[PDB]
Symmetry: C2
DNA sequence: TTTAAGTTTAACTTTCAGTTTAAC
DNA sequence: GTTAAACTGAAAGTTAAACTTAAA
């Protein structure tokens, strides 16, 4: 339905500390994408649960992270869109 | 760069109270899209500033709302993408 | 004087595991 | 005698409000 420029998105995220760290949390010590529950993310970055959780929620809405039911809770991984956004940043650095 | 299905997004937002109300806040009494600062939104919906603000920020990242500098602060309006998402909901109702 | 936004703390609503007791 | 359920002991998460810092 709608075409998306991945460079603008990455540009926007880069200008917003919380979005940026929420995104990068899913990338591990060896550069590999990983699974995380909401609590892990909030613990990993130094921002409050409300901030981090709301960001996680919106990023799943945006389709940047995936949600999958696991136990009676949920886990988050970067979507293919998520991984592509992360790539723009890696190239900068 | 990336194609987007507007129905899935709307589906995701509809399953998340905060995202949904943050989005609809921009639609006024007469059905018209309107401008809002971050404070207006948080005051309008009954959720905490941290939740609402983080959601606003991520929605601008996603390209659902636009940011424009005004005074030395910012204001938010739905993008064309934002308006299209709102339309799916209007059709449901 | 009404200034706005963000962060932290407190309160309220919907925590998990182990042990003991009761019922089949 | 074994299994299941409930209660108690060692509760967690989210949202809202208030205060402080950067104030117009």
């Amino acid at each position: 339905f709608y075409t998306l420029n991945i460079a603008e998105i990455a540009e926007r995220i880069g200008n917003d500390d919380c979005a940026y760290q929420v995104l990068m949390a899913f990338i591990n010590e060896n550069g590999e994408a990983q699974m995380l529950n909401k609590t892990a993310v909030a613990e990993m970055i130094q921002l409050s649960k409300p901030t981090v959780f709301a960001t996680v929620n919106s990023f799943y809405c945006a389709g940047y992270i995936d949600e999958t039911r696991v136990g009676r809770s949920k886990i988050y991984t970067l979507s293919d869109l998520g991984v592509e956004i992360v790539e723009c940043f890696k190239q900068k650095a």
